[PDB]
From Swiss-Prot, chain B:
Component of the mitochondrial large ribosomal subunit (mt-LSU). Mature mammalian 55S mitochondrial ribosomes consist of a small (28S) and a large (39S) subunit. The 28S small subunit contains a 12S ribosomal RNA (12S mt-rRNA) and 30 different proteins. The 39S large subunit contains a 16S rRNA (16S mt-rRNA), a copy of mitochondrial valine transfer RNA (mt-tRNA(Val)), which plays an integral structural role, and 52 different proteins. Belongs to the bacterial ribosomal protein bL21 family. It is found in: Mitochondrion. Transmembrane segments: none annotated. It comes from the Eukaryota. This is Large ribosomal subunit protein bL21m. The gene is MRPL21.
Curated annotation (Swiss-Prot), chain D:
The gene is MRPL50. This is Large ribosomal subunit protein mL50. Keywords: Mitochondrion, Ribonucleoprotein, Ribosomal protein. Belongs to the mitochondrion-specific ribosomal protein mL50 family. The chain holds residues 49 to 158 of 158 of the full protein. Its main location: mitochondrion. GO terms for cellular component: cytosol; mitochondrial inner membrane; mitochondrial large ribosomal subunit; mitochondrion. It is found in: Mitochondrion. One of its GO terms (biological process) is mitochondrial translation. Component of the mitochondrial large ribosomal subunit (mt-LSU). Mature mammalian 55S mitochondrial ribosomes consist of a small (28S) and a large (39S) subunit. The 28S small subunit contains a 12S ribosomal RNA (12S mt-rRNA) and 30 different proteins. The 39S large subunit contains a 16S rRNA (16S mt-rRNA), a copy of mitochondrial valine transfer RNA (mt-tRNA(Val)), which plays an integral structural role, and 52 different proteins.
Curated annotation (Swiss-Prot), chain E:
The chain holds residues 2 to 108 of 215 of the full protein. Component of the mitochondrial large ribosomal subunit (mt-LSU). Mature mammalian 55S mitochondrial ribosomes consist of a small (28S) and a large (39S) subunit. The 28S small subunit contains a 12S ribosomal RNA (12S mt-rRNA) and 30 different proteins. The 39S large subunit contains a 16S rRNA (16S mt-rRNA), a copy of mitochondrial valine transfer RNA (mt-tRNA(Val)), which plays an integral structural role, and 52 different proteins. This is Large ribosomal subunit protein mL43. High relative levels in skeletal muscle and testis. Lower levels of expression in the heart, brain, placenta, lung, liver, kidney, pancreas, spleen, thymus, prostate, ovary, small intestine, colon and leukocytes. Expression is coregulated with TWNK. It is found in: Mitochondrion.
UniProtKB/Swiss-Prot annotation, chain F:
Keywords: Mitochondrion, Ribonucleoprotein, Ribosomal protein, Transit peptide. Disulfide bonds: none annotated. GO terms for molecular function: RNA binding; rRNA binding; structural constituent of ribosome. It comes from Homo sapiens (Human). GO terms for biological process: mitochondrial translation. It is found in: Mitochondrion. Belongs to the bacterial ribosomal protein bL20 family. This is Large ribosomal subunit protein bL20m. Its main location: mitochondrion. One of its GO terms (cellular component) is mitochondrial inner membrane. Component of the mitochondrial large ribosomal subunit (mt-LSU). Mature mammalian 55S mitochondrial ribosomes consist of a small (28S) and a large (39S) subunit. The 28S small subunit contains a 12S ribosomal RNA (12S mt-rRNA) and 30 different proteins. The 39S large subunit contains a 16S rRNA (16S mt-rRNA), a copy of mitochondrial valine transfer RNA (mt-tRNA(Val)), which plays an integral structural role, and 52 different proteins. Interacts with OXA1L.
Amino acid sequence: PVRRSEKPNWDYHAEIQAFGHRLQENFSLDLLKTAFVNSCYIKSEEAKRQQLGI
Amino acid sequence: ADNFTLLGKPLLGKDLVRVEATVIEKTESWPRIIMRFRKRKNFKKKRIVTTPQTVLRINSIEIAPCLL
Amino acid sequence: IGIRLTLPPPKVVDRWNEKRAMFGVYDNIGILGNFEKHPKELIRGPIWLRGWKGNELQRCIRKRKMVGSRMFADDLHNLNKRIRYLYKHFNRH
Amino acid sequence: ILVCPPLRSRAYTPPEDLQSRLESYVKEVFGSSLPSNWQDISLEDSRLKFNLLAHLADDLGHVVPNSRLHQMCRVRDVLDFYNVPIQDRSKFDELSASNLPPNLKITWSY
Amino acid sequence: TARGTPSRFLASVLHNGLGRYVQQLQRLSFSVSRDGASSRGAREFVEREVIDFARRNPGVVIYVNSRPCCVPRVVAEYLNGAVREESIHCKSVEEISTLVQKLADQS
Amino acid sequence: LRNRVTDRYFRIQEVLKHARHFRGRKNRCYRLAVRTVIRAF
C-alpha cells in the first residue's frame, strides 16, 4: 500500500478545499494546511534535500 | 417509554408525537436473480433486477403533553 | 487452455497504401465515360464469374458450361457430382 | 525557394467600424450611384460580388466560405456575416477559459 | 445467490446523519477520449454537465483526464476507502448524469 | 472466412463462479455445474 497523494488524480490544494466544504466548515486554508504538517515530515524532507544537494 | 405507552386508534395525533428522520444514503440493492425453469436452456436466460433503496436515520422521537 | 497467454503481434494496417487509396476509382467509367465501358468489365476473377451472380447450383452449372472442357478429370468428376447433388437439394427431392 | 507563410489564426472579432468600412468598400466596387439603401444592393453580378468579398477578405482577413457564398444575396447579408465573431481556441482552452469551480480539475493528455 | 455471496448488516459510516450529514463521495475521476465514438456521451457530459455538478457538490473533487481510450470510465472514491469504477462507454449524457448522481448519493 | 469462438473461457466462468461453493465435481466441471447452478437459481 502507498499514499493516495502518490497515486494518479491527486491535487493537494483541491483536496484541502474539499475537506472543509465536505464538513460544512469555513476553514482558513493557511491554518488547515499547517494542521497536516507533522514534525516528522519536516525532518524527513530536510534529510532528503541535504543528501540530494540542490 | 420505559413506564408508559401511547396507542393510536389507529394513528396517534400529530400534536402528541413527532418522529423525524434524515436521508443518509440513496442506493440500489444487490443483484437479485430471477430464474424460471421453463422448457428450454435456462441459464443464459437468467434475469437480474436491482431495486432502488433509501437509508433513513431516525433522528429523534418527541412527545408533547397533549393527552388531557 | 484454449486461450493464448500472450497478446498477438499488433496489427498495423496501412490505410493509405496504393490499393486502398485508389479503391473505387473508375467504378463510374460508364456514367462518366460515355458508356464506352461498363463497370462490370473492371471485375477481375474467374472467367465464369465476371459480372454475374448466382447460387451454388447456378455457379456450378455455369462453371461446367464455360470451362468444363478445360477442367482436370478429378475436378470435373467432382463438379458433375456436385451439380447432381445440388440439383436434388435445391429442387426439394 | 518558396517559404510557406505561417498558419493563420481563425479567430475573428467584428470591427466596431465595420459598417463604415463596408460602406466605403461598397462605394468603391459599386460606385456612388446609389448611396440610398446601400445595404440593399444586390450581389447577383458575379464580378461585383467577387470584388466586394475579395476586398473584405484581404482587409479583414476573414472570408465567406464556399458553403455561405450563395447566401450573400445582398450587401446586408455580407454585413451580417462579418458581425459574427469566430473563436479559434481548442476545447481544452475553452474548458479552462470558462471559470471552473475549485474542485474541478481538467488535464489534457494530448 | 445469498449462500453464494457475502453479506453484511445495515450500517453507516461514522454514524453519518446523527450529528450532521457528510457526503461520503469525495473523488470522481473521469477518463474521456478526445476522439472516440464511445466517449461521445462523456465528452458532452464534460461540456455541459460536469461544471454544474462540481458546483453542486463542493465536497467532491472531480478530475477529468482527456486521453486516448476505448472504454471511458469514472472512478468514484469514498471516505471509507471504497473505490468503485464504472464504465460510461457509449452512454448518453442523461445516462451518465444518472450514474454520476447515483455515485454521489451512495455511502 | 472461418470463425471460431475465442472467448469460450469467459462464457464458462460465468457459470462456474456460481458453483465454487458446491460440493464435488459440480463445483468445477461445467456440464455438471450448469445443471446444479440452474437449480440453485
